[PDB]
Predict the 3D structure of the following.
Amino acid sequence: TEDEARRRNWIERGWAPWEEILTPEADFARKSLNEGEE
Amino acid sequence: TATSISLGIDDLLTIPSKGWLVQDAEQQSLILEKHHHYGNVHAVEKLRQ
Amino acid sequence: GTSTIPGFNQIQFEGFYRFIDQGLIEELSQLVEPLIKERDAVYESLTYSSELYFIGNIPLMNSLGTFIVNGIYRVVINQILQSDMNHLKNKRIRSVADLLQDQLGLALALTTTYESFFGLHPLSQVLDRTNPLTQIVHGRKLSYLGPGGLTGRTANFRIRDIHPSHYGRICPIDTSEGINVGLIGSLSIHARIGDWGSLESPFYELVEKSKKAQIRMLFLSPSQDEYYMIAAGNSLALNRGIQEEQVVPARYRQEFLTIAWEEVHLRSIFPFQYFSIGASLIPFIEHNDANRALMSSNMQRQAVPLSRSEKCIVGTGLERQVALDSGVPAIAEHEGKILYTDTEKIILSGNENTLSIPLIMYQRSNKNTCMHQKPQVRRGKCIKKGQILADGAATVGGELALGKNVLVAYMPWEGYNFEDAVLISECLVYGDIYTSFHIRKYEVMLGSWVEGRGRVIDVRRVYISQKREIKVGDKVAGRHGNKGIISKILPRQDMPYLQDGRPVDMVFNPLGVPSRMNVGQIFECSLGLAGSLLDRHYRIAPFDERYEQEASRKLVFSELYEASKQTANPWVFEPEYPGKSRIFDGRTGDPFEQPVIIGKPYILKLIHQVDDKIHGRSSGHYALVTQQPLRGRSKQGGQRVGEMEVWALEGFGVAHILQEMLTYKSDHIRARQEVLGTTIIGGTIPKPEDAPESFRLLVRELRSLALELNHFLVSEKNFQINRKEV
Amino acid sequence: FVREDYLVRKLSAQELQDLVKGERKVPLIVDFYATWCGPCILMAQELEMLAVEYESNAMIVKVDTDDEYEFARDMQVRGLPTLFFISPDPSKDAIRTEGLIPLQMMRDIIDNDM
RNA sequence: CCGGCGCGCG
């Protein structure tokens, strides 16, 4: 499930949700591609 | 025969605005390639453009 | 082949040596030189083979890469087969080394089986000796057919296509025409066969500072071709940044990119890397559509050696390589001095070693083309080992010379160049510009004029020479896919003439350029004229626009102006319309209204000509079973009226024309004899009313399957049933 | 069975020293060259032609400056291509020619000075 | 005067 897989990733693979400081273009690409193509 | 149509290198007429239009398309392709490298567009968006 | 173009026969040469090296030992799990000379094997129809000690005879490969069996030159061609199925990394190439060693596997389980291998195997073919170009390109073919290989019906539609792994290994232009399209390949100029049966091409490595990299030229098998970013552009670009982030087109992972120079691993720098020999002899090929490049390569292989040969004013620089690797010219095997020269021999002496080199004088090819050699050196000239001594047929000064430089205009002339017809001048006829010697063989006093009319030149087998001047119906072509049939020959006073008063030799239709899209012929004709006036020859590598935009235009226009200025011929370069000039009608003396592109291109004469295609038949011999007229010009046979021709006659409603060609012109034995008699007396031909021998033949065959087929006539008068004899 | 393609032999500084010290009957021509030098290709072909010309009447040798740099500097070599024409008579003095001199110039030097 | 194989032209 997507609660134990994340814990396993953290413990065994060093995963951490580090903050990605994005440019306005990358932020717009992430926020706008979630809706659709055109 | 009397008129004697022929064909030279000069007669092959490119329209005057080809250099203008090719340069604009090159400028747009250069800009999108940089922003694709930035991660601002994805591969399909670059391929379509 | 790291720094020069490799020998075109190096693949055959290396393969045979490998077979002698390890193939003989690997199969036997001691050879003596052949007693017969190579010339003697073909002269009296033997096989050039060496003895193995007495196990058998092993055929020997000539330095040109061809074997001799029963006095017949033979070539062993390479095969492609399965090692993304169409990826070249999943293929292997079997050379003569694999084919000769494999037959040794069958031989040991010699003389007879090797004799039957060259005679019967599809991959063993008779060497084409039409011209020096055909001798070398035959040995570099790649085939998917042959034993263990796919048939044309078996061929998949995804095969026959261009795969990106072919770049630098298989020429994307050269292919066979017809059902075998895309299945007969051709090796590239710089291609090489690796140790794993894969094809390799050389690429220049760009590597970081901290690396020795003694040799930066390394060959890629197609398996490792994918994982390199290979660029074909140049580094002549600078902006306010620095050179490393300038972008160039590149290849990576079967697709084309545009990345910075700092991300490029390898560079494609050889000019002839991606093409075969045929496509590498086309000047200004980058201005011709690739469709005509395939046909141009085929046409160059049909060129007839002319009785007198001359070099092309405009070339690519590969003519010298073709001449050297064809074996047609005489190449010195020892340094020394020239002491004696004549038609029959050349005497060379060096380091207390004096050799005598015989010269070929009017010999016959497999394609009825003459071979001849003339000295290229004088007495008292110092010679290095490997330098030319004499010039062969279709070879001048150590270069391939398949055609002539003639004055040419591109204009319509009264419909005599309609579609693809060519109008020529009488000067090409009485000047012997396009005269070729042709020799047949037939299995009579020497020097007699037999009456196929010709002069008997050699008796052993009778050889008859035929001097063939250019004629109406002959085929001529340029090196840009521009073919044409000669339809009219005019006196020199009738041809259009230039502002210097010189009449042109050929007139070409200008309408053939736009539809065919071969602009390279316009470039070559203009530069050929400039070179003739400037006493210059040009050898230009393809894709010259890599230096600058319109590089070919700058070269042709500037050389045209140099010829115009130096020779004081203002019509040669016209500022108003460069390359074109106003010419005059030879019949009226009045100028043609528009300027005409003129020049001196290189035009070839092809084997396809009249005197080998005109056929006529009245009657004669018929087949034994079908009783129909024979098939073939050589057998004096008739023309077939196929089912599509029968449909046309039925569409016209000509029911009596159809019956003529169905009964008493083909197989009605009784009615064929009466037609022969009535026409000589002119006494009306009656209807056959009986069945032709093809229907009676079918009835008997159906009888052999226990089936009876009877033809009955029911009278419309008294309803009596009549059984027709069949 | 197969003749060699090149008649000009490459010698070391010690081998050339022994050749000059030893008795000589024919003129000795010493070439100083480097494979990275562009003009040395044309000189190489010219000297091959000259060696073909003088079968046994002259000796043509070549010294690579990438292996005998100090030896070349000692012999007063200021650049490439550089040729040294050494007469068989020890009394006479050798001639050093600098540049891509013509083949006829080499023939004249050998005939009228060695 | 029979068939296979190879190469071509339109």
Observations:
- Chains A and C do not touch (no CB pair under 8 Å).
- Helices of chain A lie at 4-13, 24-32.
